[PDB]
Paper text:
Two Cas12i (Cas12i1 and Cas12i2) proteins have crRNA-guided dsDNA cleavage activity. In addition to the double-strand DNA (dsDNA) cleavage activity, Cas12i2 cleaves ssDNA in trans upon crRNA forming heteroduplex with the complementary ssDNA, as well as processes the pre-crRNA to form the mature crRNA. The Cas12i2 consists of the recognition (REC) and nuclease (NUC) lobes connected by the wedge (WED) domain.
Only 4 nucleotides in the seed region, 6 nucleotides in the central area and 9 nucleotides at the 3′-ends of the spacer were observed in the binary complex, suggesting the crRNA seed region is only partially pre-ordered. In addition, the PI domain is almost completely disordered in the Cas12i2–crRNA binary complex, while it is ordered in all DNA-bound Cas12i2 ternary complexes, suggesting that the PI domain is not pre-ordered prior to DNA binding and is stabilized by interactions with the PAM sequence. In the Cas12i2–crRNA binary complex, the Helical-II domain that is positioned closed to the RuvC domain acts like a lid covering and closing off the RuvC catalytic pocket. Therefore, the Helical-II domain blocks the active site of the RuvC domain prior to the target DNA binding.
Numbering used by the authors:
A (entry chain G): 0 to 174, 267 to 677, 684 to 838, 851 to 1032
B (entry chain A): 0 to 174, 269 to 677, 684 to 837, 851 to 1032
RNA sequence: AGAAAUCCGUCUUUCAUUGACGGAACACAGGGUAUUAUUUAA
RNA sequence: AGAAAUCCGUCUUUCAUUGACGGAACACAGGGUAUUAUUUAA
């Protein structure tokens, strides 16, 4: 029982001059000792034998390679700091064979036959072990004895058996009773570092041992993976297909400045074979199959294949092959990985040192609370090492309003109680009234406000008293004075199992990166689901939103797409001016206003406008002269910094993030154009900075904005989903991920964040594999039937344009290519419902720009005849439609209709996708 | 740990001619035996003795009166059908003292000293018992002995010890008794040859009637004795004379008078009305109005204002303690004088056949491809003329019973207890390929079959999991059958735990219900009354919605079309008012009053109520020949285009409209007949005079009753669905699980009926000032209350706002007014208008010097910049409540009078208050 | 074991032969506290 | 135990000294398918 979770806090210590020097000296002492154990432990682990690896490997599920474990511990790439006995990339195998008494394994030969860091060199750890045995004055076998004991007692970590924390110090030096070298080891360590202290030696050992063990295990896995890479590297029959794929770059399809390796995912992987199969249809519109496949790949899992290279493959499709080219792409991948990725080196690292029971308890705290301001300090009582050598405890203060608010502030409520004072845990601070009168520096106002609210709560007798029962708090401090504080708490008895009455939910991600949730209940009786093996019921549906108010107006940071067209006329007007005055880009036609009009003719919202205008500015900058670029430089600055720039406005929507990316592209295109970079002179970050420092300043700021925006978006999505769970007694959450030890940054972030957050509220998280969850029919798919449907959209017939017919034709010609078939049949249903079958053949003839194309007003007249007027609503099977025709009511607000003589629920498609993940068991 | 629930079905049996005679003969035989058993059991119970009552009453929790139990069983008022030994209304005390051997108690004497039904007479049960002992050929003590044995063995029901269900028949007849043979011969001679089931049913009917009436008479006699003690308590009857001299006085124009009970005066709180009246005379009824509002808000009946106006006339002289005691005296005297004692008559209950319905799994189905077999069969034992009992099949029809249970499911995996939306199953909707062609008088039922049939072809119909082995069926002389299905539900509790979810619900002044959903949490904000930590989940409004071509109407609160959308109806109404002219002071030719309606731009149902009142007023004075045409216009009002017989939601507005239309017809009848106080009219005269209009009276009352029933059911359904969607396990409402509104009583009793079906636990409490309590602050621990506010733009502050401010300000003394008083104070302090306070104290109804509304508007516009700003005004029945915490969904945070406040839906606050109540 | 039957009801200036839905049973003198759109703009 | 300190961040043509809010930590060739109102009426 007892689920446990950790919440942590971060700040920087603010000691005075004496204590600051004490802390820095203590931390430097701890580094110096840590590096010393690093070298000595490097020698010890160099001294291990195969038999030891046998005892440590008795219990493992997978039969382990002893020779490789011995190799990774006996030879390491290290920095100059921890290098004693150098060895060359030739002598490695020769000496290994000498040490093991057998032929060097093929996997070990790959480990040795590897690229190494520029600043890292090889080291013979066994020879280091022998020289350590002399420098200790003991016989080799005595220290081998002691090492045998330590590995047995799990005092040290061996191949797959991790150590028991820091027991080695108490076992060996604190006075597992038979040592040969104990006195020598203790004197060696004590002479080289500092006088015996259990805590200090423990921290030194921990840092050194952690670095060495993680890098050794990484090298073992790396050697096996590299051997498999090599075994596949010779697999190719002939690099003829590989040369033609690589020669893609030479041909006219690629105009890019710089070349890149062609990996399997660029081709779409396995489905490219399906693509050729769809290509067998004819070359009538290879493009439609390209687009459908790419769209499906981007929707489900992998990165969308780049279309250009696939058009070039379409050029050579008959000769080269499907299997042969795709294996050729695999060859490109494997060779580049084999050559590029170096072997992991063993270097000390920059982790901090942890003081145990370092924070004074909140009830035992000392507060200088004044009536007009509380005491916002949290004190640590650390042991520090003076120059003389004695250890004494000193008080060091730090500031953290979050830690103060959630835990550290003293609550004075007689009856009220809480674990953490934060809205996600159920507590809201009383808002500030118009009597507040905060007067402090601006650079503190936010923090001051928090204090005010807390103090107000204390004044009202409202501040709840924490019930965490904290007995000790650790604190982890680094050389920069940054402190990290973990609070570990108990949550509740563990569930894990899904009974009747239990509530679960699923969540899915849109193409526009907007999330949606679907909440279900396990019921005693009703509708049966074969995958789950129980009876399910639909509770509710909705979208994930994170809302803030600005003078009473609500903005959803996660999906706000900006001002509508008519509301940013002036900004548009300024853009118009710049586009008018300036004139076209490199075919030297189109003096810019035409494109601007095209952007404005769609009447877009503000952030889409900003993205498209950023694309237009990079295009404009592209050809222009060095003297011309000065003028444009000024306008770029107003675009990025004034009135509506991404540095001033932008929500957390996908639109805003791509706008920032496009603005970065503007600056990069500026730098390329001015520098005339090409294959002869590949401009670097350094050259951009030296050339133009301020615009590099802008580039840095933009990447910073971007990173913070992504982090904030992930945190907010997780928060919104957790609140929705908390209000609806949801006990289980399912998302697109796997919990073991191909992805989107948003999908990865949200999944790992919910993994972090759900155990705090005793909510159990599951991961699954979302394959075509956008199209599966809830309660029908895999129960037991395996049923799919297409996505629809609802549009008034007055606005059926040429693109509706283009989409209809494209969906109809795509029966063979994967997700296309559901769309093909969808069009069939459409034709069956509105009785337009006669047009089908003419729709087959609908090609890109034919004059003889059946026009849209024909369709409008037929649909108006069929529905009476031009304002009636029709449903059209289109990709990424917002309407899903569900067999059952599995979305909130879904309505019931009859389409093609079939009972149907008009549902939010995204809500259907969320339900489909909620009903998934296979990951 | 296994609670039970019952769902029942009602229908009518449709046997053929032969089986119809068999069934009617069986039922008539069963009545005849039941009536015989009634007379004989009346005699047997006439023979009980005090010692028997002791032996049955030893283990009573309370102290019981044996003499009264003996008396109520020894003398009964009966109908002529079961009357044997007539006894006169004088001789009872004498004969009772003869039979008991002691002085007849005054408590027992009151039961004898009573009014009785016109067609009911007293019965000497002792002499009937004596002669029954004769006719059996036995001695008195032998049957006293067997009666003792029967009473001891819980075979018969004596005062507090209910009988065993039907052990008597098997115990006394089924094969150290003394008389067994004589009694068996007696029953079998009079009734029919021994059958355990038939004799059991006969006995059950007779015995049940007798025991209910005996216990009821015991309670009635005790209550009457206390009423007599309190009626005779009052020394000087002068004050009551002053009340009815009120009746003679001018404050009354109604056709007929009535007894003046305590609740007409406001009860206890009337004393404070004096205390309020002592404050200041000049403006008397302001305090009166406050109390009426106060009384209507709580659980009480509104005192009629007219009587208090006269009471104020005589307040100084007639006194306060004397007036309320005198009103209690009138109440007690009329109750005592005109409530009869409960008589023992056989009754119309039906007879229950056990295991009478063929199981659904063993049923015979003549299923055709275009129509299923919608018959449910019974296999009943019936008595032929020869005397033998034989089983026959009789079919009946019930689409609800068929849909929920009886139809066979063909889904491999789906399952259900009942196929109804409240239990989680929705029938597949009909497609445009359905093609139903049947009689119109069946289309609804046909539609149900179609849906079920469609569900069957799709493999969708879930298989019931009720595990039914036997079903009873209760049949009466009219062929009406009732079928109870009893099902297993789950292990309840009264132990709210952590994670348990509860809710409360309250009812508005406009009969609009609201619900508040809370959770018991491990940590957070403590509630002293509950003894736990609570958290607020959500809040809402109870709605029951139906669609009409995609437009949603809430039956519970739809107030009808908006003004501009019903011009035509108004034109007709306007024309009729135009042509016609005023009513009795015979001024004000009707149109102007009509415009008084239209100037407020009301919605349709409010318009219909007010216009119905106006037709009533018109009808009042008019001549007999004139009424000729007014009748036809009344008819169009009630029957065409928008009359209540065609439109009307379930809102309080529509019900008041129906009440007003009935008032119209009653005023018609009075006006046409020129009935008066000494020349009264009866229903018989109304029917004979104008039969068709009495037919509309019938139809209107039927509509009223059906609408009320539907409203109660829909409110219960909506609340139960809301609970089911939110894992709510507890419900709390204003009731007690054993002074009321029919809606409050009905909703509480219906939720009591429905919640145990979903393993939901219902609690009742006492809603006192729940409209004003501050959630999580009231009784935590201090008792804090607040007034109700409303939000209005300053452009529309009128004279009535100033009136309400003045009235609330002068009402510090009278109960809830105190809170409203402070509200106005807070109001002024917030808007910095304290200077006006004194002038607001001078604001009387129609003064010329009144501070006008535009002063306030100019001042408030100054304070808030514009005339479109929103201000909060303390008004009675306001829709806004200023809560200490966020205890309503959609609540916003403001600062009022330098106090942080949540603007909450007031009704939602009341629901939260009901949810946090533990004392009833 | 006999093809008939609205089980009882509700809503809508919409009364619907595919409109949408709900139900254990018993037995006061004259009435305060709008929706689609879309038009020249802000 | 020393009166200072935005812990780190987000939103808004609103940048706020009472605006509203969120967070365990580690370590490619040129862009893809509106809201308040209230005005002559229905």
């Amino acid at each position: 029982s007892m689920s446990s979770a950790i919440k942590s806090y971060k700040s920087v210590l603010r000691p005075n001059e004496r204590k600051n020097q004490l802390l820095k000296s203590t931390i430097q002492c701890l580094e110096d000792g840590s590096a010393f154990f690093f070298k000595m432990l490097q020698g010890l682990f160099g001294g291990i034998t195969p038999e030891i690896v046998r005892f440590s490997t008795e219990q493992e599920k997978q039969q382990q390679d002893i020779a490789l474990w011995c190799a990774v511990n006996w030879f390491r790439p290290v920095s100059q700091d921890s290098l004693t006995h150098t060895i060359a990339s030739d002598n490695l195998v020769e000496k290994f064979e000498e040490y093991y008494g057998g032929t060097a394994s093929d996997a070990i030969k790959q480990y040795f036959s590897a690229s190494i860091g520029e600043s890292y060199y090889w080291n013979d750890c066994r020879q280091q072990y022998y020289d350590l045995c002399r420098e200790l004055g003991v016989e080799v076998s005595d220290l081998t004895h002691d090492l045998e004991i330590l590995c047995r007692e799990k005092c040290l970590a061996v191949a797959t058996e991790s150590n028991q924390n820091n027991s080695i110090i108490s076992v060996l030096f604190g006075t597992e009773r038979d040592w040969c070298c104990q006195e020598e080891l203790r004197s060696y360590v004590e002479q080289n570092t500092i006088q015996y202290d259990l805590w200090a030696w423990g921290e030194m050992f921990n840092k050194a041992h952690t670095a060495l063990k993680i890098k050794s295990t990484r090298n073992y896995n790396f050697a096996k993976q590299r051997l498999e890479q090599f075994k596949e590297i010779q697999s190719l029959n002939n690099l003829l297909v590989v040369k033609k794929l690589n020669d893609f770059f030479d041909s006219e399809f690629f105009s890019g400045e710089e070349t890149y390796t062609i990996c399997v995912h660029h081709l779409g992987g396995k489905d490219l074979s399906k693509l050729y199969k769809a290509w067998e249809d004819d070359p009538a519109d290879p493009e439609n199959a390209i687009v459908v496949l790419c769209d499906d790949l981007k929707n489900n899992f992998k990165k969308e294949p780049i279309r250009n290279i696939l058009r070039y493959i379409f050029t050579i499709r008959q000769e080269c092959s499907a299997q042969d080219i795709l294996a050729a792409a695999k060859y490109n991948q494997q060779l580049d990985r084999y050559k590029s990725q170096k072997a992991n080196p063993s270097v000390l690292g920059n982790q901090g040192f942890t003081w145990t029971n370092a924070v004074i308890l909140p009830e035992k705290a000392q507060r200088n609370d004044r009536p007009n301001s509380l005491d916002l300090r949290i004190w640590l009582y650390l042991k520090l090492r003076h120059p003389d050598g004695r250890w004494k405890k000193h008080h060091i203060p730090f500031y953290d309003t979050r830690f103060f608010q959630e835990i550290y502030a003293a609550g004075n409520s007689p009856v009220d109680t809480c674990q953490f004072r934060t809205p996600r845990f159920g507590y809201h601070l009383p808002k500030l009234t118009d009597q507040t009168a905060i007067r402090v520096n601006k650079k503190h106002v936010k923090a001051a406000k928090t204090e005010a609210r807390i103090r107000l709560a204390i004044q009202q007798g409202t501040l709840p008293v924490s019930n965490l029962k904290i007995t000790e708090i650790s604190a982890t401090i680094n050389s920069k004075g940054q402190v990290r504080i973990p609070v570990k708490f108990d949550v509740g008895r563990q569930k894990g199992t899904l009974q009747i009455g239990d509530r679960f939910c699923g969540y899915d991600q849109n193409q526009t990166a907007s999330h949606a949730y679907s909440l279900w209940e396990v019921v005693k009786e009703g509708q049966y689901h074969k995958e789950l093996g129980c009876f399910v019921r639909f509770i509710s549906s909705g979208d994930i939103v994170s809302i803030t108010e600005n003078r009473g107006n609500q903005f959803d940071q996660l999906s706000y797409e900006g001002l509508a067209y008519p509301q940013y006329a002036d900004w548009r007007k300024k853009a118009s001016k710049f586009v008018s005055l300036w004139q076209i880009t490199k075919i030297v036609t189109v003096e810019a206003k035409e494109k601007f009009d095209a952007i404005c003719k769609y009447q877009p919202r503000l952030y889409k406008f900003n993205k498209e205008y950023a694309y237009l500015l990079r295009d404009i900058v592209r050809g222009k002269s060095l003297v011309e670029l000065q003028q444009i430089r000024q306008e770029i600055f107003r675009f990025i910094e004034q009135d509506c720039g991404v540095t001033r406005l932008g929500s957390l929507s996908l639109s805003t993030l791509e706008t920032v990316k496009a603005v970065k592209g503007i600056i990069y295109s500026y730098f390329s154009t001015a520098l005339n970079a090409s294959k002869n002179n590949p401009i670097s970050d350094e050259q951009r900075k030296e050339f133009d420092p301020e615009l590099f300043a802008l580039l840095e700021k933009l990447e910073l904005i971007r990173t913070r925006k992504k982090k904030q978006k992930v945190e907010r999505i997780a928060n919104s989903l957790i609140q929705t769970c908390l209000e609806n007694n949801i006990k289980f959450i399912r998302g697109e991920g796997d919990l073991s030890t191909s992805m989107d940054w948003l999908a990865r972030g949200v999944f790992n964040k919910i993994r972090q957050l759900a155990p705090m509220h005793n909510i159990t998280l599951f991961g699954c594999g979302s394959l075509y969850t956008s199209h599966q029919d809830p309660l029908v798919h895999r129960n037991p039937d395996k049923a799919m449907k297409c996505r629809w959209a609802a549009i008034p017939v007055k606005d059926i344009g040429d693109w509706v017919l283009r989409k209809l034709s494209q969906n109809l010609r795509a029966k063979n290519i994967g997700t296309g078939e559901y769309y093909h049949q969808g069009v069939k249903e459409f034709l069956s419902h509105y009785e337009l079958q006669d047009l089908e053949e003419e729709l087959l003839k609908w090609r890109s720009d034919r004059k003889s194309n059946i026009p849209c007003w024909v369709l409008q007249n037929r649909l108006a005849e069929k529905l009476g007027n031009k304002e009636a609503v029709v449903y059209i099977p289109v990709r990424g439609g917002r309407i899903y025709f569900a067999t059952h009511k599995v979305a909130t607000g879904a309505v019931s209709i009859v389409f093609d003589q079939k009972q149907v629920w008009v549902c939010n498609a995204d809500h259907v996708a969320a339900a489909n993940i909620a009903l998934t068991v296979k990951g």
